[PDB]
Design a protein around this ligand. Structure first.
Ligand code: NAD
Ligand code: CL
Length: 312
């Protein structure tokens, strides 16, 4: 009864979105510039949904067969977007390519559909520059693997209509994800700014030999990361003293003292990358089979954690 959802780009992220939207009861049309990618996407989604069902990880109440019947290939973009209510773009991370596609869509779409990019790093102000339908534009950035990790960052353009944000929020909630709002665009949005703050100090600590990369990673996974699975950094402050003000009173002099001892932004030189890599390879060799085995274990853990979080 409501429009379908269109996925523009049936790759890694496109396929995950398709599964998310199908589980919410939405009709999904998969478009790609390569028709073979639509065919492969439909085959891989069929195979993955069977795997999820067997793991007990398939979302919502609809059967495998119900959800799969919601997803079809649609190689014609005009037909795909006709009557759509949401278009999620999932083409490669390339500003000129995204702007081209958006300019094509701009000339054919109606005033109700929402146009949403999956981009992890491009600014809405550049993506949607000069578009007639700029009010309908938004970034909805997911976290890979989005079927297990629910966070979606919603990042508007300055001229994005509030209704676009609210509609997109409600849509993300219906499919089971966890939308949040980035009020004004900034480099890295929110998630990558925190991630890169951590990477930057970790890199310096290991380059300096304060700890090995493997021990630094245990400091996170047997320590700080266990807390962060459930509570964010600001709530941690709140709970680790008698409230946030108490925590600042106790610890803020120290936080400043520690931060004032930070080294400069790394170069991330090839020489240092190679030394870090040599260390990483002791635990996880950088050939395809070893990397894929470790990612499969990672994803199983993510899936089990998602299930735990849903119960508490
Ligand atoms: N971990 C991730 O992979 C990840 C996580 C979050 C966000 N993102 C973002 O999602 C977007 C897509 O990433 P991906 O990893 O799924 O890319 P991908 O390379 O897996 O898939 C891209 C798809 O776009 C298709 N394509 C290329 N040009 C096209 C065009 N003109 N029109 C239609 N389709 C076209 C390709 O054929 C391909 O199937 C990127 O902006 C990326 O930054 C990726
Ligand atoms: Cl270099």
């Amino acid at each position: 009864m409501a429009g379908c959802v269109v996925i523009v780009g049936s790759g890694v992220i496109g396929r995950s979105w398709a599964m998310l939207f199908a589980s919410g009861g939405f009709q999904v049309k998969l478009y790609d510039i390569e028709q073979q990618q639509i065919r492969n996407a439909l085959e891989n989604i069929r195979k993955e949904m069977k795997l999820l069902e067997q793991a007990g990880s398939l979302k919502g109440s609809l059967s495998v067969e119900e959800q799969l019947s919601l997803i079809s290939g649609c190689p014609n973009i005009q037909e795909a977007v006709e009557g759509a209510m949401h278009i999620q773009e999932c083409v490669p991370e390339d500003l000129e390519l995204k702007k081209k596609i958006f300019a094509q869509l701009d000339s054919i779409i109606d005033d109700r559909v929402i146009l949403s990019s999956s981009t992890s790093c491009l600014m809405p102000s550049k993506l949607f520059a000069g578009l007639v339908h700029v009010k309908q534009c938004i970034v909805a950035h997911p976290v890979n693997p989005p079927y297990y990790i629910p966070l979606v960052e919603l990042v508007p353009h300055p001229e994005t209509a509030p209704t676009t944000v609210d509609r997109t929020h409600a849509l993300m909630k219906k499919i089971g994800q966890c939308p949040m709002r980035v009020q004004k665009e900034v480099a890295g949005f929110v998630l990558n700014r925190l991630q890169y703050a951590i990477i930057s100090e970790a890199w310096r600590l290991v380059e300096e030999g304060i700890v090995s990369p493997s021990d630094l990673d245990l400091v996170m996974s047997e320590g700080l990361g266990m807390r962060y699975a459930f509570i964010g950094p600001l709530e941690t402050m709140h709970l680790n003293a008698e409230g946030m003000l108490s925590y600042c009173d106790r610890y803020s002099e120290g936080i400043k003292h520690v931060l004032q001892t930070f080294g400069p932004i790394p170069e991330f030189s090839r020489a240092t990358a190679e030394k870090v890599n040599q260390d990483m390879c002791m635990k996880v060799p950088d050939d395809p089979e070893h990397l894929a085995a470790r990612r499969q274990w990672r994803d199983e853990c993510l899936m089990r954690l998602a299930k735990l979080k849903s119960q508490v």
